[PDB]
Each structure stands twice: as structure tokens, then as C-alpha cells.
């Protein structure tokens, strides 16, 4: 279990994907050209997880960039580490999907999906021990959501024994007041419930709230949002890419984080919260990181964990600090907040320390499988239902070949998902 094939689809997907490769390249000593300038070796022990060692001690992101809109390929390349990606790995269409999931999933995107698979095959066949896939995509658009989930389903068929992991950006009208996005998200969530083993729910609602209410950014930009994402993405993958006392792979994470196949939507949380540039170098104490990483204001999904129960939690502390302190502080949070963890999953909190920090001195990254995430799904379900009851814009979808019944089936599967979450939130040991 070593190589992860990363795929980024659509404008959001490519945009946060590029940000991810910047942040982790930097963390691994890699530069915009592939050359390792790291001052510590463990930055390369686990480098093979996200990078193919090419020629010249060159490290190339094992990254496939996909989009039905040719435009984003250029913005990707104009990027800092935009020249680091294999030119053969840019699979781009010509028209785009126009926020229409059905175009991404059934027509335009189905045209391009075979081109993407070929590259996936190439990158997979050159893998010593492929552990699975990581896709970055928005759910609110057409390509990331519609083609992304088609891309997930196709990969799944060909690589059924590999882990499928997504970083899925949930839509929010606070960030994009496009009213078909609930449709796209709901159709996508129906796909993600069945075809992904692990989905990090990255919620634009939460990202906006953090920037606006906490970081006091009055007009948050995608760049501000994506700073939270990339910090989150670096955090949650720390232990895929750094040795540590844990030999973490995507499957051991899944086995310990997913008690029920459909409840694989994780709420990530991060501490400390910072704006771009912000000289917030005040540091933070273990007890502070531990508390904050467990606060609704630090969650990347607009969910109050205190409204549900934590089925499983994995926390990655990063930096110099007494693993004995983190052991004590983490026990502390678990006993003071006992009623927010299910009692029928013993020892459901897992903690790792990792010496290398992200660009701060201390971070905590939280990965919660919390029943409170039903709040996110309920928010989207309600918007979906508002639109769908009036059949607004349904013709955009049915005219691409989608059946109206796919909408009702998505909505039902999402409502079922929320009920499952409530079921385990209310279950007791006795």
C-alpha cells in the first residue's frame, strides 16, 4: 500500500487540487520544477505516495487534471507548480458542462471519460503498490460533480479493490448563489454514497463562515476559502506522506473510520485557523489545539458536532509536542465531552503526532465521522426539495437524457442517509 493516484476534475477540483500540490510539494522540499530542496529526509521517505520519481531526481505529482472546460488547464499551468504536472496528464474538453450535472455525467463528460481512464491506467500500471485514488471536485458544478462521479464509478469498476477517496466541496449559496447546485450536489451525493470509501465533506458554507465570522474577511474570495481547504488537505493527508509512529494507508483509515458502508462522509476540522498572510504566529498549546480542533468554528463542514455524536475520530497533531500531552489532552476532551462520542464503539478516537508542521509551528487536523454531518445533507436536501418541488430547471437535466426518477432517487437516498445518521446518533449501548 503506497501510491495514491490523484485526480482533479472541474474548476473547483483543479483549483483546490493545484493548491494541494503546492502546499504538499512545499512540505516535501519539492520546487515548481520537481527538484527536492528538503533539509530533512523524513520529506522523502513516503514521497512515492503522491509523486512519481522521473529523470534527474525529478518528482512528478501522480496527478491527473481533468475538466470539460479547456480554460482551467491554462489557469492550472499559469499556477506556481503548474509546470510540475505531466503534460500527458491534462485531459480537457472544449465546451464545459455549464453547471449541469447531466452534461458532466451523461453526455459531454461521458465522451471524455475514456480519455481520462487511459491516463488513469497509465499512472496506475506504473505503481508498485497502488493503494487507491484521491479525487478533488466540487459537487455544485457539472464537471467535478457529474463527470467526477462518473469517473469514480468507472475507476471503481476497473480497480474495485482499491480505496476511492474524494475531497468533495459542498455548495453553499453564500459562495455561489447558482440555484441548480443543490441538484448537482444531491445527484453527486447519491453517487458518493455507493462508490467512494471515504469522502471529506469540504463545505463552502463552513469555509465562508470561517472566513467571514472568524477570520473577519468581509468579502471572502475562493483564494481565502482554498487556503482553508489546502491546510485541511495537507492536514488530513499528513500521515499518508510522513513516516511517524503510524504506517497510515487509505485502507487502514477506512477500516477504522467507517463503521457502516454508507457513513463515510467525514467532517474535517483544523486548528489553528489562519487567513492568507496573517501573522498569527502566537502558537497554540496542546490543550488549545485539542479544544479548537473539536469546536464547530474549526469544522470545514457547517455542522455543529455538539448536535450529533462522533462515531470515530482521527486527529493528527503536527509539530513538536509531548505525545504524552496529546495522549492526556485527547483523553481529557473525550471524558469532558463523553456524550458526544458513541459508547458502542470503544476506543473510537485515534491520535497521531507528526513532527513536521505545515508552515505554522503547531497544527491539529481533525477527521470526524460524526452523525452531525446530517445537518449538511439536510441543508442540501431542503434546497434540493425547494427547487425540485417546483421542477425548476429540470428540463436542463432531462434534456440531457436524465430521467426525473434519478432526481427522486438521489433525494430519497440522501433522506435515507440522514435517517441512518440519526439512527446511530440515537442508538445506545443497552
Amino acid at each position: 500500500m503506497r501510491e495514491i493516484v490523484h485526480i482533479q476534475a472541474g474548476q473547483c477540483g483543479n483549483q483546490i487540487g493545484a493548491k494541494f500540490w503546492e502546499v504538499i510539494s512545499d512540505e516535501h522540499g519539492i520546487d515548481p520544477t520537481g527538484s527536492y530542496h528538503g533539509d530533512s529526509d523524513l520529506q522523502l521517505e513516503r514521497i512515492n505516495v503522491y509523486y512519481n520519481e522521473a529523470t534527474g531526481n525529478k518528482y512528478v505529482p501522480r496527478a491527473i487534471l481533468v475538466d470539460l472546460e479547456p480554460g482551467t488547464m491554462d489557469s492550472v499551468r499559469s499556477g506556481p507548480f503548474g509546470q510540475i504536472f505531466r503534460p500527458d496528464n491534462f485531459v480537457f474538453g472544449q465546451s464545459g458542462a455549464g453547471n449541469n450535472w447531466a452534461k458532466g455525467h451523461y453526455t459531454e463528460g461521458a465522451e471524455l471519460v475514456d480519455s481520462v481512464l487511459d491516463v488513469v491506467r497509465k499512472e496506475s500500471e506504473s505503481c508498485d503498490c497502488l493503494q487507491g485514488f484521491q479525487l478533488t471536485h466540487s459537487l455544485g458544478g457539472g464537471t467535478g460533480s457529474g463527470m467526477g462521479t462518473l469517473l469514480i464509478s468507472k475507476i471503481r469498476e476497473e480497480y474495485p479493490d482499491r480505496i476511492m477517496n474524494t475531497f468533495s466541496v459542498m455548495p453553499s449559496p453564500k459562495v455561489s448563489d447558482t440555484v441548480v447546485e443543490p441538484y448537482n450536489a444531491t445527484l453527486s451525493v447519491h453517487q458518493l454514497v455507493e462508490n467512494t470509501d471515504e469522502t471529506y465533506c469540504i463545505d463552502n458554507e463552513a469555509l465562508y463562515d470561517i472566513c467571514f465570522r472568524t477570520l473577519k474577511l468581509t468579502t471572502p474570495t475562493y483564494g481565502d476559502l482554498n487556503h482553508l481547504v489546502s491546510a485541511t488537505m495537507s492536514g488530513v493527508t499528513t500521515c499518508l506522506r510522513f513516516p511517524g509512529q503510524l504506517n497510515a494507508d487509505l485502507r487502514k483509515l477506512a477500516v477504522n473510520m467507517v463503521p457502516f458502508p454508507r457513513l463515510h462522509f467525514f467532517m474535517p476540522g483544523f486548528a489553528p485557523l489562519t487567513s492568507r498572510g496573517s501573522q498569527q504566529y502566537r502558537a497554540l498549546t496542546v490543550p488549545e489545539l485539542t479544544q479548537q480542533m473539536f469546536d464547530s468554528k474549526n469544522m470545514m463542514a457547517a455542522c455543529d458536532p455538539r448536535h450529533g455524536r462522533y462515531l470515530t475520530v482521527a486527529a493528527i497533531f503536527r509539530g513538536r509536542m509531548s505525545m504524552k500531552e496529546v495522549d492526556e489532552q485527547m483523553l481529557n476532551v473525550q471524558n469532558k465531552n463523553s456524550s458526544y462520542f458513541v459508547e458502542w464503539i470503544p476506543n473510537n478516537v485515534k491520535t497521531a503526532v507528526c513532527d513536521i508542521p505545515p508552515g505554522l509551528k503547531m497544527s491539529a487536523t481533525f477527521i470526524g465521522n460524526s452523525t452531525a454531518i446530517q445537518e449538511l445533507f439536510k441543508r442540501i436536501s431542503e434546497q434540493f426539495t425547494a427547487m425540485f418541488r417546483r421542477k425548476a430547471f429540470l428540463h436542463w437535466y432531462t434534456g440531457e437524457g436524465m430521467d426525473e426518477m434519478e432526481f427522486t432517487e438521489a433525494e430519497s437516498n440522501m433522506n435515507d442517509l440522514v435517517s441512518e445518521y440519526q439512527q446511530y446518533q440515537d442508538a445506545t449501548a443497552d
Partner: protein, 155 residues
């Protein structure tokens, strides 16, 4: 049947085709099978100029389709602020209730159209109106943790 053509022209945003059909006797208040009028469609698809023109030609600003949706419902759902205001200025019932008990305030709130929320409130939207499940727009804001909305609704 110019009525059927007006409906399509209204949906499609063809201003000139609307003007022509009206001038040839097209039923401004024609209805598709769902009871949608040209004004419903223009309000849904964001055709502000068609909305204004229909309203100067006898459009019933408060027409309801089979599900009780008024044009203001759809404009509030979809988020067309300018159409919302034009509809209100021509007598749209700010508190019209559809077959789900939804008022335009309910739909603007659910969809996060905060400016529309404010406009509806200034125009007398009933923050105590409950949908069929008992939710007022404020309940929706509290249930969904939409603090921005909930601040607007507390004025």
C-alpha cells in the same frame, strides 16, 4: 395558438417575439399544462424585461399554477432580485402561500437569497407564516444554522 408561443417566448427570453405575439392577440394569461403563465416563466428564467412587459399588458401578477406557485414564489426561489421588486411593485401578494405552505419568504430563505429576504421583509412578508410542516422562515434559519439569515430575520 399564440398562447403556447408566448409561453415559449416568455421562457426563452425573446422580448421582440413577446411584443409581437401580444400585438397579435396572444393570451398574456395563457397557461401551460402545469398552470404556468408567461409571467411565471419569465420570472423563473430571469427575463426582467419580459416580466415588465407582461405586467403592462394585463398579466395577473398573482396567477398561481397547479401547485399554488405565484410568479413571486418562483422569482424568490430562483433568486431574481429585480423581478422580485418589479413583481412587488405591481401588486404581487408578498404572503402568497403555495401547496407546500411556502411563502416567497420561505423560498428565498431556504435558497439563501438574503437580499431577496430583506426585500420581502420590507414589503411586509409574514415572518410568522408557517409552511405545511410548521416552519417559519425563522425556523428554517435556526434549523439550518444560517446565522446571516437569522440576523436578517430578527431585523
Amino acid at each position: 395558438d399564440l398562447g403556447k408561443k408566448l409561453l415559449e417566448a416568455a421562457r426563452a427570453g425573446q422580448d421582440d417575439e413577446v411584443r409581437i405575439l401580444m400585438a397579435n392577440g396572444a393570451d398574456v394569461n395563457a397557461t401551460d399544462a402545469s398552470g404556468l403563465t408567461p409571467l411565471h416563466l419569465a420570472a423563473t428564467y430571469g427575463h426582467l424585461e419580459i416580466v415588465e412587459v407582461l405586467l403592462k399588458h394585463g398579466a395577473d401578477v398573482n396567477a398561481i399554477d397547479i401547485m399554488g406557485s405565484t410568479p413571486l414564489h418562483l422569482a424568490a426561489l430562483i433568486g431574481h432580485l429585480e423581478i422580485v421588486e418589479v413583481l412587488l411593485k405591481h401588486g404581487a401578494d408578498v404572503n402568497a402561500v403555495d401547496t407546500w405552505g411556502d411563502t416567497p419568504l420561505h423560498l428565498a430563505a431556504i435558497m439563501g437569497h438574503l437580499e431577496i429576504v430583506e426585500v420581502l421583509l420590507k414589503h411586509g412578508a409574514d415572518v410568522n407564516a408557517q409552511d405545511k410542516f410548521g416552519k417559519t422562515a425563522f425556523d428554517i434559519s435556526i434549523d439550518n444554522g444560517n446565522e446571516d439569515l437569522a440576523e436578517i430575520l430578527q431585523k
